[PDB]
């Protein structure tokens, strides 16, 4: 009786999806918060 191995797609997605989402948040907030003119 063999069993399924843990999906390498899942294994690398666990590190990829949070990492890319965090980098996107970094870039988005950095490029949008500092946008208005100043005196």
């Amino acid at each position, epitope marked *: 009786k063999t069993f399924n191995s843990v999906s390498k797609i899942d294994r690398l997605s666990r590190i990829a999806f949070p990492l890319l989402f965090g980098i996107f948040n970094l870039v988005y907030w950095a490029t949008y918060l500092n946008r*208005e*003119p*100043q*005196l």
Partner: nanobody
Amino acid sequence: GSLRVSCAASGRTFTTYIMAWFRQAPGKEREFLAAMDQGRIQYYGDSVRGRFTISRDYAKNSVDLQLDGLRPEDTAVYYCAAGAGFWGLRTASSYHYWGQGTQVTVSS
């Protein structure tokens, strides 16, 4: 001497923006000549009040400046600008879009 410097915008409709003309002489800082608002209201600098006349063609998305009574100290690079007028209508920092500039010289 009389002149008319025109400015045409592309890639964005500036109907709801203020369009302005600035001037930069050699060594001197950039200064505000004129501005015109969506409400057809015209603002002028003290140095060029009554001489320079600003107008806008909203259909063509352009701003024109008629120059009359030119003098030797009017020699400078003249810049077209468009902006929302935040903290401004007179400060260059309030205008996000800028033209390349056009040289103008007066010879006696």
